[PDB]
Design an enzyme around this catalytic site. Structure first.
Site, mmCIF file in Angstrom:
data_model
loop_
_atom_site.group_PDB
_atom_site.id
_atom_site.type_symbol
_atom_site.label_atom_id
_atom_site.label_comp_id
_atom_site.label_asym_id
_atom_site.label_seq_id
_atom_site.Cartn_x
_atom_site.Cartn_y
_atom_site.Cartn_z
ATOM 1 N N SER A 41 37.403 45.506 40.513
ATOM 2 C CA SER A 41 38.596 44.725 40.188
ATOM 3 C C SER A 41 39.892 45.322 40.712
ATOM 4 C CB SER A 41 38.708 44.490 38.689
ATOM 5 O OG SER A 41 37.804 43.474 38.271
ATOM 6 N N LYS A 205 45.885 49.441 37.674
ATOM 7 C CA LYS A 205 44.830 48.432 37.672
ATOM 8 C C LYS A 205 43.486 49.142 37.724
ATOM 9 C CE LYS A 205 42.759 44.462 37.621
ATOM 10 N NZ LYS A 205 41.718 45.060 36.730
ATOM 11 N N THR A 206 42.570 48.751 36.836
ATOM 12 C CA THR A 206 41.247 49.352 36.728
ATOM 13 C C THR A 206 40.171 48.495 37.390
ATOM 14 O OG1 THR A 206 40.940 48.230 34.619
ATOM 15 C CG2 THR A 206 41.859 50.452 34.538
ATOM 16 N N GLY A 207 38.994 49.099 37.513
ATOM 17 C CA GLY A 207 37.768 48.364 37.789
ATOM 18 C C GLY A 207 36.604 49.123 37.189
#
Length: 260
Positions: A41, A205-207
């Site tokens: 993501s 922002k993570t994933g």
């Protein structure tokens, strides 16, 4: 020292990629900074930047509305699922895909910039000739060594954080809106944010694929004023579960904090 990233990698298994970059001094620290890692993501960050670039060019409005249909809804679409049968603004789609990782929202935004190929062309035009966006959600989360689809490098994504948040790729209003979205991220509290020292404003922002891979990309602005840092972190093929990988990301934050 950067050897500490190798030591940390040994506790995690898999491959840990880190790029900690301070544009105003040229200082740079990391591990596997030019290797390819699946974005997961984190691809939603350049996606939102591309949307804002198209808006700045007068070719799209943040107030343009996009229809949501039942067939658009896929796993983990917490905002878009409430608007089936009506529409949502591009602005609200961008917010949803960034702060909670709404998957349908990303799939609804992608066609507005000509899909994964259009996202890749945008990245190339802005100077990133590494990152490849090839698929939409959920297949973009697949990864195989030797297959560059949906991959980036830690250095490339740290570069994109700089380009889009600190450089002049975006208008001042668009750049600030993008920073505000990252500052408002809802999914990073146990990751880089949890290891970084006090005194820094974080946008991230993570994933995570929920199985063996977790990523977190962040801009760090000093609350005392002064020059920001960019920090990209990709952990792929780890033997650790989500909680253990979050701990690795925390420790990356702690190691980075020693430079701040």
């Amino acid at each position: 020292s950067d050897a500490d990233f190798a030591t940390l990698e040994k506790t995690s298994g898999g491959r840990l990629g880190v790029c900690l970059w301070h544009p105003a001094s040229g200082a740079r620290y990391g591990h596997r900074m030019d290797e390819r890692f699946p974005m997961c993501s984190t691809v939603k960050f350049p996606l939102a930047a591309a949307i804002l670039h198209r808006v700045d060019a007068g070719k799209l409005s943040l107030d343009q509305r996009v229809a949501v249909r039942q067939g658009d809804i896929i796993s983990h679409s917490p905002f878009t699922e409430r608007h089936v049968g009506k529409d949502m603004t591009v602005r609200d789609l961008c917010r949803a895909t960034l702060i909670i990782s709404d998957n349908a929202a990303a799939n609804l935004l992608l066609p507005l910039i000509d899909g994964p190929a259009g996202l890749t062309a945008f990245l190339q035009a802005q100077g990133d000739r590494i990152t490849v966006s090839a698929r939409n959600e959920p297949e973009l989360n697949h990864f195989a060594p030797g297959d560059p689809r949906d991959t980036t490098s830690p250095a490339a994504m740290a570069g994109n954080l700089q380009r889009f948040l600190l450089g002049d790729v975006l208008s001042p209003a668009s750049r600030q809106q993008l920073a505000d979205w990252l500052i408002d991220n809802q999914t990073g509290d146990a990751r880089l944010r949890a290891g970084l020292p006090q005194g820094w404003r974080v946008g991230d922002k993570t994933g995570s694929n929920g199985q063996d891979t977790s990523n977190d990309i962040a801009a760090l602005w000093p609350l005392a004023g002064g020059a920001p840092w960019l920090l990209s972190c990709y952990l792929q093929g780890s033997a650790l579960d989500d909680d253990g990988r979050d701990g690795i990301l925390r420790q990356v934050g702690e190691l980075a904090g020693a430079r701040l």
